[PDB]
C-alpha cells in the first residue's frame, strides 16, 4: 500500500523515490561531467540505434538560458518536462530580480520541484537526474568559477568535482576516484580533464568511442555560454588518449 503512493514504509523509506532512481539506470545511458581549472565539461552518450534517425535531433544537452546547460539522464521525456520548468523558473527569476539566475540557485529550485512530488500524492515523480553546468561569480574579487550541480528524484541537490550518472555509474565513478588521487581536477587543463572523462566512459561501457558516440558541452572562463563542443575538438581528445 506504500509501494503505490507517497507514504513512508515502516523503515521510514519512500518506495516511489527508490523506483524513480531505477528509472534512471533503466534508460541504458551514461553521462560524465568534470570541472577543471578554467572550465566545466559534460560528456554524455549519443545513442542512435536506428539507421534512419536524424542524429542531430537526439540530444540530452539543453540550454536553460544562455549561460546554463543541462544534461538529462534517465527517462527522456521526463527530462524535457524539467527542462521546460527550469526555463520558466529562469525566466521568472530574471523578470523579478533583473539579472540571470545563478546556476546554484536554479538547481535548488528544480530540487524543490522534485521534493514536492515526493510529499503530495497523485503526480508521478520524474525519473531523471538533471546535471546543471555553468559559471558562477564570487562576490569577493568578481572572478567566475565553473560549477556542476546534480538534482535527483528525491529532491537532493549537490555540487561535484566530477560525477558519472546512469548505467554503470558505479564502475565509472570508481575510475574517476582513482584518477582524482593523482591530481585534483581543479588543477587540470581542459584537455587533461577530457582524457579522464572519456576514459571513464570507455572503461565503463567496455568499448572504444568515436566522436559520433558522445555529445559534449562546455562552459569556460573565456566564454561563459554553455555551448556544444564541435566534433573535431573531441576527435583531438580521443586521439590524445589512444596514444597515451
Amino acid at each position: 500500500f506504500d509501494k503505490y503512493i507517497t507514504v513512508f514504509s515502516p523503515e521510514g523509506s519512500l518506495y516511489q523515490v527508490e523506483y524513480a532512481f531505477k528509472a534512471v539506470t533503466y534508460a541504458g545511458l551514461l553521462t560524465v561531467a568534470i570541472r577543471c581549472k578554467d572550465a566545466v565539461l559534460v560528456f554524455t552518450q549519443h545513442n542512435v540505434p536506428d539507421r534512419l534517425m536524424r542524429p542531430d535531433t537526439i540530444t540530452s544537452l539543453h540550454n536553460i538560458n544562455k549561460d546554463i546547460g543541462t544534461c538529462i539522464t534517465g527517462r527522456a521525456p521526463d527530462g524535457k518536462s524539467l527542462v521546460q520548468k527550469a526555463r520558466q523558473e529562469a525566466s521568472e527569476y530574471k523578470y523579478r530580480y533583473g539579472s540571470p539566475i545563478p546556476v546554484s540557485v536554479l538547481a535548488k529550485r528544480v530540487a524543490d520541484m522534485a521534493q514536492v512530488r515526493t510529499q503530495h500524492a497523485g503526480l508521478r515523480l520524474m525519473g531523471v537526474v538533471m546535471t546543471f553546468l555553468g559559471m558562477e561569480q564570487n562576490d569577493a574579487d568578481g572572478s567566475w568559477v565553473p560549477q556542476i550541480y546534480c538534482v535527483d528524484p528525491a529532491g537532493w541537490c549537490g555540487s561535484y568535482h566530477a560525477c558519472a550518472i546512469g548505467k554503470k555509474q558505479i564502475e565509472a565513478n570508481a575510475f574517476l576516484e582513482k584518477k582524482q588521487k593523482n591530481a585534483p581536477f581543479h588543477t587540470l587543463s581542459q584537455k587533461d580533464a577530457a582524457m579522464i572523462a572519456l576514459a571513464a566512459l570507455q572503461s565503463a561501457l567496455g568499448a572504444s568511442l568515436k566522436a559520433t558516440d558522445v555529445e559534449v558541452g562546455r562552459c569556460s572562463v573565456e566564454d561563459h555560454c554553455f555551448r556544444r563542443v564541435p566534433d573535431e575538438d573531441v576527435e583531438e581528445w580521443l586521439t590524445a588518449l589512444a596514444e597515451a
Binding site: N63, I64, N65, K66, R87, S91, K94, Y95
Partner: protein, 228 residues
C-alpha cells in the same frame, strides 16, 4: 524626445537625443532611449519613461525565452509583433510611441513604427517623439535611399540635431546604434560636437533690431548697447 530609425542595405541605424523632462525642467540629461531587446534588435522609446521601460523589459523577457526554445536568433517581425500587442492591449493606460528595428538574416534590416494606439507599420524610416514633427520635411527634402552605413549614421546624427535645436523637449547627447550582420556599433556625440545648432549657425549670429535708440529718424540700424 526625438527618435528615429533608418534602413540601409544590410542593416538599420537607430538614433536618439538624451533628454528626459518634466515639461520645463530637465530631470535627466543623459538618458538612454535606445533599449536592447535581443542581440540585434533594439527599440527607440518615446513617451512616458515608466511605461516604455516596463514594455521593453517585458518584450525582452519574451524574446529571450523564445530564442532558447527555438534555438535560433529571432526575427525583427517577432519583436515588433510582441511589442505591438502589449502596446495595443494597454492603449488606454499608457503614453508610448515605439520604434523597433533590427537585423536578422531572413529579412535583413527592418523598421517598424508602433505609435500611440498600437498600430504597427513597416517602413524604410520612422520618426517619433515630440521632435519628430520638425523632421518630416527634413527627410522629404534631404533623405535618400541607397545610403551606406556611414552615410546613414551621419545623416541620423544631423537629423537629431536639427530636431533638438528647435524642440524645447529634446536635447543633450546624440546616441546612435548600427545593427547589421557584424557587431553592434554604438556612438554618443556630446552637445559640444553637435553637427548643428542655432547657437553656432552664422545666420543667427547678428541680433534682431528690437531695441533701437531714441532717434530723430525713422531709419533703423542697430540695437542700443549703452545708456545715453
Amino acid at each position: 524626445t526625438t527618435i528615429m530609425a533608418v534602413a540601409f542595405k544590410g542593416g538599420v541605424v537607430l538614433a536618439a537625443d538624451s533628454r528626459t523632462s518634466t515639461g520645463t525642467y530637465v530631470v535627466n540629461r543623459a538618458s538612454n532611449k535606445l533599449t536592447k531587446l535581443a542581440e540585434k534588435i533594439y527599440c527607440c522609446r518615446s513617451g512616458s519613461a515608466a511605461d516604455t521601460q516596463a514594455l521593453a523589459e517585458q518584450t525582452a523577457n519574451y524574446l529571450e525565452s523564445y530564442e532558447i526554445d527555438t534555438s535560433k536568433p529571432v526575427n525583427v517581425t517577432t519583436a515588433a509583433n510582441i511589442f505591438k500587442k502589449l502596446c495595443y492591449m494597454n492603449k488606454w493606460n499608457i503614453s508610448a510611441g515605439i520604434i523597433v528595428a533590427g537585423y536578422d538574416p531572413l529579412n535583413g534590416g527592418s523598421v517598424y513604427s508602433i505609435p500611440s494606439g498600437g498600430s504597427c507599420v513597416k517602413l524604410d524610416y520612422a520618426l517619433g517623439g515630440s521632435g519628430s514633427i520638425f523632421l518630416y520635411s527634413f527627410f522629404d527634402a534631404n533623405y535618400k535611399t541607397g545610403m551606406s552605413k556611414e552615410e546613414c549614421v551621419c545623416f541620423c546624427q544631423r537629423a537629431v540635431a536639427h530636431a533638438y535645436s528647435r524642440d524645447g523637449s529634446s536635447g543633450g547627447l546624440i546616441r546612435t546604434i548600427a545593427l547589421h550582420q557584424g557587431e553592434p556599433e554604438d556612438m554618443t556625440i556630446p552637445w559640444t560636437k553637435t553637427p548643428y545648432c542655432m547657437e553656432k549657425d552664422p545666420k543667427y549670429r547678428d541680433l534682431a533690431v528690437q531695441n533701437p535708440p531714441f532717434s530723430s529718424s525713422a531709419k533703423i540700424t542697430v540695437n542700443q548697447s549703452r545708456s545715453e
